[PDB]
Symmetry: C4
Subunit: 272 residues, 4 copies
């Protein structure tokens, strides 16, 4: 092969591509990093034609030492990934100190990984700890209805989680830990990466009000599906609120019964 | 052939695929079972390479004895069916006691049929009785506007049916028996399968409030079209309600005249 | 060729297909007839393999004597036309008395032309007279926002036209004759065909409240574009009304100035 | 090659095509001109088979002397560009006086460039001056939510810019100069071209109320992305307003902090 025909390159294309068709990634909005194994990239090693470029990390991340990822690039449009994956994606590998990374493949013409890379790498660190290495994906998109709801709902993790759980029956089961909400922060900073990574200790979903959502999961499909579940519920809520609000909904005891049946432990603070 | 090129595999792909593009099937939301004849699958029998796996049924269903179906799998994403039908779909055949089924094809890597299988198989039983074997499809999707309306309209079969009939002229003719509404229930249970199947005795459409819709029909296109008709009307209603409500609509006598002309008998309780 | 590769078969596919992707043609909703010349079909005459079937017309239409059309079929889904044009479309030719027609090609397996055929053929008669044979297309679809607006706006040709003209600057220039609105009527009847055809004497667009729109034009693209213009304006209006209504809009004198510049004569009753 | 396989022809197709799928370009609504270098077209010169046609300019534009562009045609549908680029696009070159242009390629069957050509060429002149020749694209589309907002928001550059900046965090960084709003004007006139070009001295985005948006940028992707950013924010706002308005938003100081971090100078009048 073509590394472009690898599962993980095809995976990034399906997804940046799916996010774009959803309307979640105007322009260069949004970013997607995927943690790989050395075994994933090894069979494609003769596709690495170029001299790896080194970029230091803002802060040391020893958990991620020697770890490869595939990533979307800075300033790159989700829409374009399907047209030219080597232009728009890079395979990088964190060095043995976790002090920086080498770009092994892609990100042609001096492109570099996403400028939300701190939010990404720091959140991977927390998700690996939190899930005992199960989670491998961090996805950020500008999910339209979730964004709209941040102008309108109390920016309160419990109330926001509870509305999303009410807005589609499956939500409690897909994200029983709820949705962490940050205060608005300047994007692309270490501060926002750190705040996001802290919230990723507690939730697989983190909202950036007036901006977008970060989601974590074990696979591209599951991470995309997680965000899509929250955003579908958000879409339902936007319609309901636009119609003047709920007259009936899923009750607290129904939500509790739901969690019991599906063997999850829903965020207690959201069950007033 | 390729069984993947059979009409029924191509049928499941067109439809799980169409439902996904409609935005009705985020993540693994939704499921689709199709009742086949032995004659459908016979010409593709050398495609069955694997040793059939047996799964017992929750409750005996002798009506369905020796009956083949093609089904979407548990945890599977509608979006993915077009990319890998053998991964995401299975052909199963109910055993001669109707006490369980064998998976003949697909659902690779230990996958199993949808966990709403009770709602499906039990509803097939009722629809076969109700339609003298005409109906062959049960489709469940998360139809967005219908979901939204369950938060806002009286969860009353007559009022809900009447609004949907008003929301597009064709509705009364496509679903003269209306739309049965269940109370909210925990999904994936025998209880909800039983409640859905009871309502399928009376209606080709059954709403799961705050969740989605179940529809039944003779073919994939007709079942999809049935749900699409209800959901289009729901979409119109959501817009109308968002604009402050109706100032004029189809009257009771117009609805009655409509039913007469098209030779259907509309749900009388919905014609206040 | 393949007649399936003819301009007019490819034309019907692009359009029934485009209407479906717009969300305007759920199930079998909507229909599309296109008036052809003998010269269009002549080079494909060896594609007519079957014995033409004769169907009498409900009422005589001598204007249409010996005239060929390509048409969508009764009960057929717009969505399916691209998958199987001979199944879903027919080429018919009105007989020399205009008392009935022969199906020359397509509409396989005993299918027949659309059951709105009276609205179609009668409207073609009026549009040919009205445009000195320029108009060749009648398109009916279930345009979602236009439908929604019929529940909410005064069902008054002048007020409805004026709102649509206000809802996108181009509207007055594309449909200066406005949009005729019928009372609700039972579809598929001679009565509704006759009422629609009468309104087509005065407008290129006719609204069926709580149902859909009929549009006429010289080509498939222009007829589709006409409806799309009205429906885009309707979409804008639905958003504006959902937001609490207009605070500013295009004025009467701006509309008048617009008509003057583009050499059209806008419906005077709509210019209060 | 095929000039149809050139980057700039493929560029116009991706974009008129992308705008159409967004729902921004019903019928012939919208237009797209791209400033080329002689070097772009030189390698495809044997594709120029036809005798160039000369069209005089409404007013002299010496800045544009000898300059080639690729352009969408008058009356042409964005949707169709992908089906037949030579029908729907033209390559033109302004003559050495900037008094008129020759059509070198495309615009077959006596077609001519867009009738908003004054808004285009005059705006290119101002954008070249304003950006020291960096900007190369002028795109006009009927962006749906931005149109809707012109009926509802104060048609005030400062307030409108500030709402759009609030409606998605990235907006201030993508268009720190804001969005110039014109009064409604008759389209296709020198007057509206002149007014638009004046506003392009100050903003990369110009709104035509009740009509659409003009955007300028260095590349097709960046110009499309600019409009898409504004329109995504507009979409969010429409949802928020439909839900009864904002309860919280990005503050003035957050916006200021944002501008500082990203090294832009936001429109001060918009920072009340
Ligand atoms: Zn972002
Ligand atoms: Zn090697
Ligand atoms: Zn938290
Ligand atoms: Zn479900
Ligand atoms: Zn065999
Ligand atoms: Zn019932
Ligand atoms: Zn209709
Ligand atoms: Zn012959
Ligand atoms: Zn009239
Ligand atoms: Zn325009
Ligand atoms: Zn040469
Ligand atoms: Zn200005």
């Amino acid at each position: 092969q073509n590394i472009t025909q690898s599962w993980f390159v095809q995976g990034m294309i399906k997804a940046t591509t799916d996010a774009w068709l959803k309307g979640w990634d105007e322009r260069n909005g949004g970013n997607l990093t995927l943690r790989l194994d050395d075994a994933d990239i090894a069979p494609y090693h003769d596709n690495f034609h170029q001299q790896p470029r080194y970029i230091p990390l803002s802060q040391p991340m020893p958990l991620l030492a020697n770890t490869p990822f595939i990533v979307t690039g800075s300033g790159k449009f989700f829409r374009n990934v399907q047209l030219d994956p080597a232009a728009n994606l890079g395979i990088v590998k964190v060095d043995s100190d976790g002090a920086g990374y080498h770009i092994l493949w892609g990100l042609t013409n001096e492109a570099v990984p996403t400028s939300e890379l701190p939010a990404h790498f720091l959140s991977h660190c927390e998700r690996i700890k939190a899930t005992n290495g199960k989670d491998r994906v961090i996805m950020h998109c500008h999910a339209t209805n979730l964004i709209a709801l941040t102008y309108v709902l109390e920016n309160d993790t419990a109330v926001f989680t509870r509305q999303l759980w009410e807005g589609s029956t499956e939500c409690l089961v897909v994200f029983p830990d709820g949705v962490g909400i940050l205060p608005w922060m300047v994007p692309g900073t270490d501060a926002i990466g750190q705040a996001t990574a802290q919230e990723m200790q507690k939730h697989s979903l983190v909202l950036w009000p007036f901006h977008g959502v970060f989601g974590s999961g074990p696979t591209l499909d599951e991470t995309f599906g997680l965000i899509d579940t929250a955003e579908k519920s958000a879409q339902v809520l936007v319609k309901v609120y636009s119609m003047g609000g709920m007259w009936q909904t899923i009750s607290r005891e129904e939500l509790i019964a739901l969690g019991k049946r599906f063997g999850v432990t829903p965020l207690a603070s959201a069950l007033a």
